[PDB]
Design a protein around this nucleic acid. Structure first.
Lengths: 213, 141, 125, 95, 68, 140, 208, 192
RNA sequence: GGAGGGCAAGUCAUGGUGCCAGCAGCCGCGGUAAUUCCAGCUCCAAUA
RNA sequence: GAGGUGAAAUUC
RNA sequence: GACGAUCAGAUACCGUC
RNA sequence: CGAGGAA
RNA sequence: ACCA
RNA sequence: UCCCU
RNA sequence: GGUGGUGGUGCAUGGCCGUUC
RNA sequence: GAACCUGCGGCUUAAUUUGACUCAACACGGG
RNA sequence: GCACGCGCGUUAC
RNA sequence: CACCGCCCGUCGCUUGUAGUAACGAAUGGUCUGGUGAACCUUCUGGACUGCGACAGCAAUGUUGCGGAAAAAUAAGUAAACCCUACCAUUUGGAACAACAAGAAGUCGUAA
RNA sequence: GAAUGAUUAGAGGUUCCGGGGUCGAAAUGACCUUGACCUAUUCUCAAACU
RNA sequence: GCCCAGUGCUCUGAAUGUCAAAGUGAAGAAAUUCAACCAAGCGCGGGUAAACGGCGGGAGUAACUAUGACUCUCUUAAGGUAGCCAAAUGCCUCGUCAUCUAAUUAGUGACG
RNA sequence: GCCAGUGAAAUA
RNA sequence: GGCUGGGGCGGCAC
RNA sequence: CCUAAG
RNA sequence: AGAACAAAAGGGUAAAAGC
RNA sequence: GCUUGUGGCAGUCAAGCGUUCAUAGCGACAUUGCUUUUUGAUUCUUCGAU
RNA sequence: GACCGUCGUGAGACAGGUUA
RNA sequence: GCCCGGAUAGCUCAGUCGGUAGAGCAGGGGAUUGAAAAUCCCCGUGUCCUUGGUUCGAUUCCGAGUCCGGGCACC
RNA sequence: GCCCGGAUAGCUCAGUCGGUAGAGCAGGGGAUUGAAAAUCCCCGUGUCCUUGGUUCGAUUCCGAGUCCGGGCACC
RNA sequence: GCCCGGAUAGCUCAGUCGGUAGAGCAGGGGAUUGAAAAUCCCCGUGUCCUUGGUUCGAUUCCGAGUCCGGGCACCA
């Protein structure tokens, strides 16, 4: 709870383990948070790294599609399909628009809708996990998929999600919790007023918990 | 007893009482208060006069009619008099300014049931009885 | 450019045909309405015939100075005969005689149909 | 009297120059109280009694202030440039 | 009015009076005749309840003869 | 459960007493309940609280509702018996009970309620003071 | 009114007081011909006219009175068919009056009169021979009215009248107005027509 | 053997459970068991004869009641027969055991007597009699039928049928009849 | 000097008038068939 | 809520 | 006297003072 | 004229 | 007559 | 049934 | 000097009829 | 209330025959 | 007889 | 002529009337304070005249005495007149006002 | 008896739209009386007309 | 006599809105600048005229005629009450009728 | 739990 | 405040 | 007074 | 060029200066 | 003190009154004037005495 | 100096009336 | 004495930016009543005050007199 | 002579902002009454003073005028 | 010139701590009625002043705008 105990989630919580000495192999810590919890559309992000610094952790197939040319916008990589003859029948509704825009990351496709997005395609999907975000959709979905694959930084969109990092095993305290904060930027604060907008969260590394608030 | 007192010594009382309680009579109260002398004739039975003008008067209640009347000026008295000219053509003889002889109609007071404020009768024109002028074979001037 | 019912002349030959006997030859009969046909075929009066000739003299003797001698009649029950066209007959109504110029159109119709019998109503109060 | 919000009124700044659409609001007011020299000295009376100062102020107005047109580009990045239209009363873009 | 004076009399047709056939006895004679025409014993004779009116003879020539 | 307030003493053979005052005017009716000392008010229901039209502020109906309304409130005070003090603006007014009188009582008895002694306390005066109207009074 | 002192002279060029002097107390003689108008232009010939010999201001109202008594007799012994009394003066120059208790004052208009140049024709009328003395005696009237004045002269023309032009119009027996050039003869002069004339016509234009 | 109504409707198929209506109705009698609702009877003679009238005869009567159009029982007997067939085809019940119920329900139990004193119109609480109750019930039922039945292709034998059904149900939204039945009591419960 | 009543005397199928002229002591007469007006007739009363 | 009237209304 | 109400009208028959 | 106001 |  | 007539 | 008159007075009247019933 | 019908009033008209006027006039004078 | 005002009725929605 | 009956007052209208009190005047009468004709009486006065004596016989004259006209006088009776109060009898007066009488005037309705 | 804009007055239309009349009276031809615009005339004016 | 709306005065009164200085909170690094509450007073409520003073106006409106106790009205607290006058207040005014004069722009008595 | 998720808005 | 056929009320040739 | 009455 | 050119009056203005 | 509108006072023309006739006696309209005890303008003389 | 009317909150103000 | 004003039947009284004259009451003939009031239709009655002008004509629009009718009169 | 205020249905007075216009009373026709009042239902009414101008449109906004009203004219 | 309150049906006004717009009266339709009231049912219309942001949405929440209402203070 943004208090002294931050370094109790960090410093005092960095060698908890669950057995004997402390092992003999590398470490793996971070600092959990989110993306903005807005609705993955209107406003929740912009630009600027923390860091932070990371990438996947497990899988990365997100979202990118629109026309017959959006497939190759997911061929030399791996993404979801919006289909062509579906935006007039079933390419969006609940578990539909989901499918294409409901993965884990967010979305990195382009744009093309017309008079249909106030309760179907572009619509039903927003806070679900996608609704047309900033993925430099013009050359494709790879270069700006540096904001959708690796490096990172920590593009935090769709539904929660983000990253963190600072050191290895044991050598951080005030800058461990203050490294977790450092592992937060346009995700912990931003422009006009943004020093906080949530309730709680989690964190650790592999040991056991962090802040007991 | 009754109200009146029956004493042989109380004559005086009864006397004064009668003289008093007697004023309640109009006939008495009338002549007693030299009233007769104040009327237009000054008690008199008849009076001479000059015709001031022949005027007509309307009948009262159930009757509707133009009564013939002459406004007369009594001589020594000098009063305005309302005088009813009798029978039919009568007023046709009364010329304005002539001399007329007038007398009352049934007890000096109420005029004949019909008339309004008239208390006199006309009997002579230029000193010629009306009746006389009323019947051809008699007189005319 | 106007014409007339059935040919004013055909009728003068139709009425005064071979047998110009009864004022209304059985010819003219075919022309009139049932009511009229009824009457003639029933019992028409002779007076109606001397009245006829009275118009006759009025139509010729008068110069083309179009001044017809008005013929007077009470025979309001008479049905205009073809030869009766052109003359101005004075017809009684109730007060006086009405002068009416007989047009071709008023044939087969009762001579009374023109002598207004009453002055309809104007108003105010 | 119907102005039109933003209209390319050439202008400059510079570090810009040429034209540039300018979002053009009219000018408002601004409090002063307790900063103005006007105050720093005009706090007086002198002082157990006072009055004010020769110009204070009942004169005779004109019944027509002025539009403080405040044109300002966005590319030129600067700087909110004032203009002066004079004629009241009126109001922004109708039209 | 006024000019309406004696309207009646002026409008009345002056009838004349029947020039006395003979005479009307004035004196004990008249009182005598009366005595005879009414209080003479022939009238006090018939019922005093059924004797005629001293003027039923309104001058009616038809009832005038019937009586005499 | 419920937190009654009648003194801490029950018993289907232990009678509770509440003094019910009832004033019945020809305009309004009152129903009051109070300690047998009458210095602490409990229940107070008047016909006015029971209807809309000012004319009905009397009524037999208003007496029923104001009556039954009190009995319910009374079972909660844990009181079952009621003493009745009946009045009717005695003063210098029709010392006769209103209409919502026999109506109020009746309602209390029907809706259960036990009835203690019954008094009539319309204040009859010894003298008097110039009544309503004067000399001739309500005329028409 | 205010007498005839603001009377005949000059003392002021000519304040015809139109566009520049707005308030001209309206005229006085809104008549002018009052007589047997719509005349024949034959018929009521030989005109006798009333000339004034004296550079004056024959006032406003004055000209009126002229008309008044003018017609009065004109008619009163000759008829509505007899007159035609052509006004023939006419009254411009708005004169003015006067009224800081003596310091620089211009006039406010005060009645419009007219400048009888000494020799000018005034209220002059025209009628047939048999009206001579009629007219003549009458105009006398005026001379006696109106700040006189007086020609009561007998005339000729031109042709505002008879009017000598006597030998003239009595010569233009044949015609009326142009005449003028010689071309589109739409004044039925007689008699053929066009053809013949249009022969002779250019028949000379050609001689040049 | 038992003479069924219109030839196909057992009378003994019904019984009057409530005691109120027991004598103020016809289903119950031997004489009442008629094939045809036409008796040209002589009811309406004494001051209670109306009772002995075979309930449906009453219905037919109250039914031919609008002026010009009516006055001919002949037909009305029909409109009532078809209506019974139609009521059966819907609840397949002995339509008398329907019409009967309806009669018992549609009769107001309370009314207000208008008793005015010097301009003011006051009312009192009045309990409605049995004979009056039935009379009102039928009068009411039929009254409504015509209501809709007018410029409608819906027929009386249909309107009526549809009515007798809901009238038995107490369906306050489908029976112009029971509407008043309730309102009359309600308003009456107010005036009381 | 009267003739509806008081107050003796017309029940004239009389003429004129039409709430006008007028009568009438008091009742009341009179507004087109007046028993009271004007007048005829006949009657009554007191009778130089 | 009283009060007051046929109803109510100023009134408390 | 001041007010409500009632009345076509009410400084009146009722009502508040 | 679409079932007809005060009566 | 009003009541239905 | 006596309210209305 | 009559006849005749759906011409006037129902307040001059018979006869008849309506109303109170 | 509606359109016709018929009586009464009214207003017209050469003339619109006239009686009757709250039940006790008005499809009544057999209209 | 018709700008209309009444009263029996006839036909009907 | 019977509630569509009677009927009251305001104001108005129509036709009229001059009362009671006061004041004015007229006639008459009385009081108050004065002026005061005339005449009875009174004190005067004494033309004129009668007598006696003396101047002459006489007209006349002196004086004594007596009667006695005008004049004048005081007290008195007191006419008229005036002033100061009061009585009686008559008679007078007006616009507006007032009173009297009447009605299917007007507004309402008291009884 | 020139532009313009004012203003007098009658004349002539072999003239058109209407208010009065006529053989008159319902697409009445035809003349008719006041206005309504020409046409050759008459009368008198202009700082802001020539 | 009637007017408490106006101006004044004056009462516990109003469930609520302003309302200064200190005192409090919030923000800067302070200076300082924003805040919230806050006595009276104000404004809201009541009484008050032998307190200042006030006291309307037009339409219709039969029983010749003019007429208003009649009603209609638009209306501000209230719409001049007893009483009283051409008066030391009355404009027109020398008011109109009397009365006192030969005569009255004076007097007095009337009338509104 | 969540990839499923409805609803007015999904949580350890 | 002023200009003002003298001041003023008025009007603004302030 | 005119964002066009620029 | 009798109109039109916001608004007074005058100037001006016709492929226009009017639309 | 000018000026004289306004006041006052005379005057020409003769349509009219004056019953017959314009002028005995008066005169509409229109027009010429005198007057300085009205009144109105004006501000020259006199508030550094009327 | 002093009445009243009438305007004015007041002071006063009336080519209003009244008196010394 | 100058400033406005009305003049209209038997008596009290209105008038397209002239061209025609009216109700009211008196009034006589009716409808009406039992008769009458009241009321409703009808009659009637005149240089619209005398002069001069304007017009085709004036009661009217003009101008003066005229009678009676409200507002102005040493110092 | 100066400054003010209106005017709207037959009458007394509402209303508008530039589109619409009203109420009360009167009145016309039925109903109740024996008949009138009262009362009850039904109904119709407007150059928004004349006047030019603006405007797409004027009762309404300007400019002029008529009428009926009130208010100043002091030294 | 500051400081409070409001903007809702034709009128007067309620109104989630973001999910519906509701009273009372007027107006209208009907029953009742000697007349008029009072009664008694049933209805009628809403950018919830405007413009954007918060939210899945918002009469509501916040900023800003115009208007009206309150108040309090000065004025050379």
């Amino acid at each position: 709870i943004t208090s002294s105990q931050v370094r109790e989630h960090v410093k005092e919580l960095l060698k908890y383990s669950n057995e004997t000495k402390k092992r003999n192999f590398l470490e793996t810590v971070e600092l959990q948070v989110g993306l903005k919890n807005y609705d993955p559309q209107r406003d929740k992000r912009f630009s600027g790294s923390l860091k932070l610094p990371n990438c996947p952790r497990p899988n990365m197939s997100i979202c990118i599609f629109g026309d017959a040319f959006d497939v190759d916008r997911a061929k030399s990589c791996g993404v979801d399909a919006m289909s062509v003859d579906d935006l007039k029948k079933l390419n969006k509704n609940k578990k539909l628009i989901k499918k294409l825009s409901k993965k884990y990351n967010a979305f990195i496709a382009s744009e093309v809708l017309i008079k249909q997005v106030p309760r179907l395609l572009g619509p039903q999907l927003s806070k679900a996990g996608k609704f047309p975000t900033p993925v430099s959709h013009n050359d494709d979905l790879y270069g700006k998929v540096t904001d959708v694959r690796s490096t990172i930084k920590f593009q935090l969109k769709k539904v929660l999600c983000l990253a963190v990092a600072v050191g290895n095993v044991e050598m951080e305290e005030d800058v461990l919790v203050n490294q977790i904060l450092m592992s937060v930027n346009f995700f912990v604060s931003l422009l006009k007023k943004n020093w906080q907008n949530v309730g709680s969260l989690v964190v650790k590394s592999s040991m056991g918990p962090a802040f007991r608030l | 007893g009754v109200g009146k007192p029956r004493g042989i010594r109380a004559g005086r009382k009864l006397a004064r009482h009668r003289k008093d309680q007697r004023w309640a009579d109009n006939d008495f109260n009338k002549r007693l208060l030299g009233s007769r002398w104040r009327n237009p004739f000054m008690g008199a039975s008849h009076a001479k006069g000059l015709v001031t003008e022949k005027i007509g008067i309307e009948s009262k209640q159930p009757n509707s009619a133009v009564r013939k009347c002459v406004r007369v000026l009594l001589r020594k008295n000098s009063k305005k008099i309302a005088a009813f000219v009798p029978m039919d053509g009568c007023l046709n003889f009364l010329a304005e300014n002539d001399e007329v002889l007038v007398a009352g109609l049934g007890r000096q007071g109420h005029a004949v049931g019909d008339i309004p404020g008239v208390r006199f009768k006309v009997v002579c024109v230029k000193g010629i009885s009306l009746l006389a002028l009323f019947k051809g074979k008699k007189e005319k001037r | 450019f106007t014409f007339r019912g059935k040919g004013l002349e055909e009728l003068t030959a139709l009425a005064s045909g071979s047998n110009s006997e009864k004022l209304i030859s059985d010819e003219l009969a075919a022309l009139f309405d049932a009511k009229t046909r009824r009457r003639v075929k029933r019992g028409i009066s002779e007076k109606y015939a001397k009245f006829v000739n009275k118009v006759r003299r009025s139509k010729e003797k008068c110069p083309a100075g179009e001044k017809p001698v008005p013929v007077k009649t009470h025979y309001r029950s008479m049905i205009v005969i073809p030869e009766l066209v052109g003359g101005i007959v004075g017809v009684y109504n109730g007060k006086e005689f009405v002068n009416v110029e007989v047009k071709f159109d008023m044939i087969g119709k009762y001579l009374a149909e023109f002598a207004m019998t009453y002055k309809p109503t104007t108003h105010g109060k | 009297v119907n102005v039109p919000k933003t209209r390319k009124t050439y202008c400059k700044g510079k570090t810009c120059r040429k034209h540039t659409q300018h979002k053009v609001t009219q000018y408002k007011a601004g409090k002063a109280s307790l900063f103005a020299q006007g105050k720093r000295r005009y706090d007086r009376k002198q002082s157990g009694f006072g009055g004010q100062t020769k110009p204070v102020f009942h004169k005779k107005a004109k019944t027509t202030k002025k539009v403080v047109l405040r044109l300002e580009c966005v590319k030129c990045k600067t700087r909110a440039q004032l203009t002066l239209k004079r004629c009241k009363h009126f109001e922004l873009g109708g039209e | 009015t006024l000019a309406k004076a004696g309207k009646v009399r002026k409008q009345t047709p002056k009838v004349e009076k029947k020039d006395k056939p003979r005479k009307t006895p004035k004196g004990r004679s008249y009182k005598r005749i009366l005595y005879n025409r009414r209080y003479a014993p022939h009238i006090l004779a018939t019922d005093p309840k059924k004797r005629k009116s001293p003027n039923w003879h309104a001058g009616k020539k038809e009832k005038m003869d019937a009586a005499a | 459960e419920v937190i009654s307030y009648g003194p801490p003493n029950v018993g289907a053979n232990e009678n509770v007493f509440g003094v019910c005052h009832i004033m019945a005017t020809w305009n309004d009716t009152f129903i009051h309940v109070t300690d047998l000392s009458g210095r602490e008010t409990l229940v107070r229901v008047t016909g006015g609280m029971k209807v809309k039209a000012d004319r009905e502020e009397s009524s037999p109906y208003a007496a029923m509702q104001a009556a039954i309304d009190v009995v319910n409130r009374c079972k909660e005070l844990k009181i079952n018996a009621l003493h009745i003090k009946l009045r009717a603006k005695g003063g210098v007014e029709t010392k006769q009970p209103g209409p919502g009188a026999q109506s109020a009582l009746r309602a209390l008895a029907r809706s259960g309620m036990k009835i203690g002694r019954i008094e009539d306390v319309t204040p009859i005066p010894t003298d008097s003071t110039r009544r309503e109207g004067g000399r001739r009074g309500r005329r028409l | 009114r205010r007498p005839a002192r603001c009377y005949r002279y000059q003392k002021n060029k000519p304040y015809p007081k139109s566009r520049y002097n707005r308030a001209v107390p309206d005229s006085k003689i809104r008549i002018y011909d009052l007589g047997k108008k719509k005349a024949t232009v034959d018929e009521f010939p030989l005109c006798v006219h009333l000339v004034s010999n004296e550079l004056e201001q024959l006032s406003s109202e004055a000209l009126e009175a002229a008309r008044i008594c003018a017609n009065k007799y004109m008619t009163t012994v000759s008829g509505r068919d007899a007159f035609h009394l052509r006004v023939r003066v006419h009254p411009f120059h708005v004169l003015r009056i006067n009224k800081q208790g003596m310091r620089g004052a211009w006039g406010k208009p005060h009645g419009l009169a007219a400048r009888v140049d000494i020799g000018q024709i005034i209220f002059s009328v025209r009628t047939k021979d048999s009206n001579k003395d009629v007219v003549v005696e009458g105009l006398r009237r005026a001379r006696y009215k109106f700040p006189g004045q007086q020609k009561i002269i007998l005339s000729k023309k031109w042709g505002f009248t008879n009017l000598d032009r006597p030998e003239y119009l009595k010569k233009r027996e044949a015609g009326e107005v142009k005449d003028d050039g010689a071309f589109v003869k739409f004044l039925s002069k007689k008699g053929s027509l066009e053809n013949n004339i249009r022969e002779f016509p250019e028949y000379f234009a050609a001689q040049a | 053997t038992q003479p069924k109504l219109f030839g196909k409707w057992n009378y003994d198929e019904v019984k009057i459970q409530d005691p109120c209506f027991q004598n103020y109705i016809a289903c119950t009698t031997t004489k009442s068991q008629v094939f045809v609702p036409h008796t040209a009877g002589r009811y309406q003679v004494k001051k209670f004869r109306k009772t002995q009238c075979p309930i449906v005869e009453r219905l037919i009567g109250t039914l031919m009641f609008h002026g010009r159009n009516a006055g001919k029982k002949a037909l009305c007997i029909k409109v009532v027969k078809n209506a019974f067939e139609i009521i059966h085809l819907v609840t397949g019940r002995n339509p008398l055991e329907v019409f009967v119920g309806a009669v018992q329900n549609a009769g107001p139990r309370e009314d207000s007597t208008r008793i005015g004193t010097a301009g003011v119109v006051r009312k009192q609480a009045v309990d409605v009699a049995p004979m009056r109750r039935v009379n009102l019930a039928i009068y009411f039922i039929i009254k409504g039928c015509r209501e809709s039945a007018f410029k409608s292709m819906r027929s009386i034998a249909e309107t009526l049928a549809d009515e007798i059904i809901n009238a038995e149900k107490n369906n306050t939204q489908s029976s112009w009849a029971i509407r008043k039945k309730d309102e009359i009591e309600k308003v009456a419960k107010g005036n009381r």
